[PDB]
Amino acid sequence: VKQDMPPVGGYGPIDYKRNLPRRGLSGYSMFAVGIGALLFGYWSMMRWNRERRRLQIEDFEARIALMP
Amino acid sequence: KNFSLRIDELEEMLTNNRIWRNRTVDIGVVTAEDALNYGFSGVMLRGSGIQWDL
Numbered sequence: 001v002k003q004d005m006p007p008v009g010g011y012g013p014i015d016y017k018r019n020l021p022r023r024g025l026s027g028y029s030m031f032a033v034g035i036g037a038l039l040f041g042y043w044s045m046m047r048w049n050r051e052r053r054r055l056q057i058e059d060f061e062a063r064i065a066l067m068p
Numbered sequence: 069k070n071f072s073l074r075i076d077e078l079e080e081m082l083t084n085n086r087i088w089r090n091r092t093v094d095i096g097v098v099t100a101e102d103a104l105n106y107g108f109s110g111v112m113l114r115g116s117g118i119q120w121d122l
Binding site: 014 | 069072076079080
């Protein structure tokens with residue numbers, strides 16, 4: 001007989017498309033989430049600085065009463 | 069099959085990497101007159117201008 005290696009009835013297709021999905025976002029979405037996180041940080045820090053100045057006024061009362 | 073996938077993944081990795089692109093943009097410019105008379109061949113002559121293939 002003859003037992004070389006041919007392909008049996010042809011083989012399949014080999015792909016060559018530049019497969020790129022551009023999985024990302026939109027610039028409006030970026031700007032929205034950035035401004036939202038920024039405003040959240042600014043508000044919470046504003047409330048914390050208010051509380052902190054209250055406590056620093058309490059330290060003022062401490063040194064003012066203690067002085068004589 | 070696997071190498072078609074792997075070379076798509078190399079194009080995934082590099083190739084619109086900002087740092088590699090803007091690392092190498094405008095270096096090694098070769099005019100076609102010089103590409104002929106300086107005796108370059110193959111990948112250079114494909115890579116600049118003339119439509120030649122052995």
